[PDB]
Amino acid sequence: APKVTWRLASSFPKSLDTIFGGAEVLSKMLSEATDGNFQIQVFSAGELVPGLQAADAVTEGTVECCHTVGYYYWGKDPTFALAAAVPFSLSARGINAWHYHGGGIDLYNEFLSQHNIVAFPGGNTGVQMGGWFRREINTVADMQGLKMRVGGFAGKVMERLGVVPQQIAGGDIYPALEKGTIDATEWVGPYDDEKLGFFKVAPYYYYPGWWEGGPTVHFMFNKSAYEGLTPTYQSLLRTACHAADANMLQLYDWKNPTAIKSLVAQGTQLRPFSPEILQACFEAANEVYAEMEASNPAFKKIWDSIKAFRSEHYTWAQIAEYNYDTFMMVQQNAGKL
Amino acid sequence: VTWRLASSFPKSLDTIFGGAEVLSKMLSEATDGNFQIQVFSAGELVPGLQAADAVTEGTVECCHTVGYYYWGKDPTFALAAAVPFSLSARGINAWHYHGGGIDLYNEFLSQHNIVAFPGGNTGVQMGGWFRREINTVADMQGLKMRVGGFAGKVMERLGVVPQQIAGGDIYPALEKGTIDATEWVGPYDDEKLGFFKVAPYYYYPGWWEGGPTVHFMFNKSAYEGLTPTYQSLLRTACHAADANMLQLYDWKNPTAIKSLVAQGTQLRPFSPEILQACFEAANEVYAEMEASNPAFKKIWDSIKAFRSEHYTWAQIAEYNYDTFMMVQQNAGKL
Ligand code: NA
Ligand code: NA
């Protein structure tokens, strides 16, 4: 028998080789590095438990681990969302700096301990798109009354803008959109969103998804199961999560440019959210966080840590990074690349 | 497995040198000490700029280096590391891991007895350290500048007199005045190396290295001698160490740039005219190189194809979000 056989419940549908596939990547890293002695068996959303309930099964010990986004559990405690994403937080590179070198992994694990979980980053999507709409969104008034599928704590922010948020796992969004039980949806980005098929119903694809600037997709491990590993397997697990985390982001970065082109070729209309909309959403988020920080000490501790770095990050990003990337985009648009 | 690793980098830099220690620790811990890589800093086993030569020659089993140091052997060595006006860190990594880049570079490196995997990235580099402001292309005429890699050839077209010097040995050359100016990496590393004391004008961006990969290069015989299990573990650990280095730069640089400015560093953007002239010079160099060097053409054409796609997509969600956040930062709203 293998030294260790674990089951992993995914929050994600098997169609998505990006976000669901990250668990398969981890599994292969581990079995290959151990000649098959460390086996993580991977199950798509709904196979063992509903996708939005994956972490609950980990806490209960019904599965040894899951691959999920922490913000799905905002209803239990909004603190769950912070190391995944909340609106107007860090970019992928920013949050990863914080995770791996700013004490972020330990801060989140200190919170998660009481929930019988030890977690490590297990992917990032980069800046998300702004979702799929049947009509133009030019003002915040245009958002009022929209039944929109939204992930995580962004639902609470959306509520203050007059949106009616709905909670739906990835693979079950499309039928609700097609049948008209939701008006609009966000998911992730061009590759995934094209695969899920929204563009055949809703033709307006907005950007940016200010709700998720750089969301981490955690591997969450049952605390007992993790602590029962040898130090050798524990270290290998952390190394492999670190690699799989990067791998998912890199896969999105490879696939998204091709998928955006496909969506546009098929007639999809890309549109920016106006600066006014973004400001209104920022102000709504600020109010929600102010209330949450005051009433929830665990939330305040982690959010204050993220914000402290966030200001420094967006100061430095304006120097080499912004100027280089802007120059290259200008060259691209001028036909010079 | 008992290997030695020759680093191109000075031991003071826990970022770029430190990446080798990170890999060694990942491997030792994952194997209870059975896969051991002894790490040596620049100049310990071989000079920093010659690390890969030691691997080709089989004198050491591996190195941690930047491929562009070997541009004089073949400019193709530079492409999967960085050449001017290439991909960002996220862009080059998409290409390495999902665009066939790792295999393409390894197809080139096979004849040189090397198997390589990405082993770090610095993100967009800074524009170097100068004793006085440079506002025009004419201003850089005749400047003796330390610059890494194939950027030297591009710099020569602008009248710069380039040379490569390993990290650790740049500062004394700058202090003595044997070089007028230097580039290295970015605020954290450059502050440690101390250039601001001599040459306080710090330009940006370092258009020569938008997202340079720092490779682990393994002797082909040594790599092929590993069990498939250890080969896979090695690739997984390199993948994690590659991410880790970029993440450490991203954490440390924001603090270091503020420290440098507090210590008297004068941040200056390169003028649009300088950037355009450097771009046109690089374009000329690459067109010539593609015609004379089939190996270079093969890899550069692959990177170029993706570069166009990347810098189209990056204009959409990413640019709009990150620029909004920068505007909020500047307005005091964060
Ligand atoms: Na989302
Ligand atoms: Na450099």
Numbering used by the authors:
A (entry chain B): 29 to 365
B (entry chain A): 32 to 365
Original paper wording:
In Rhodobacter sphaeroides, TakP (previously named SmoM) is an ESR from a TRAP transporter and binds α-keto acids in vitro. In this paper, we present the high resolution structures of TakP in its unliganded form and complexed with sodium-pyruvate. This study reveals a key role for an ion in the attachment mode of the substrate, as well as an unexpected dimerization largely mediated by a helix swapping. Thus, and despite very low sequence similarity, the TakP fold is characteristic of a type II ESR.
In the second crystal form obtained with the substrate-bound protein, the asymmetric unit contains one dimer with both monomers now found in the closed configuration. The central feature for the binding of the pyruvate to the protein is the presence of a cation. This cation has a bi-pyramidal coordination with a square base. The apical positions are occupied on one side by an oxygen atom from the acidic moiety of pyruvate and, on the other side, by the Oδ1 of the side chain of Gln156. Since only sodium salts were present in our crystallization conditions this cation can be safely identified as a sodium ion. Among the six residues involved in the recognition of sodium-pyruvate, only one (Tyr100) is provided by domain I, while the others belong to domain II or to the hinge.
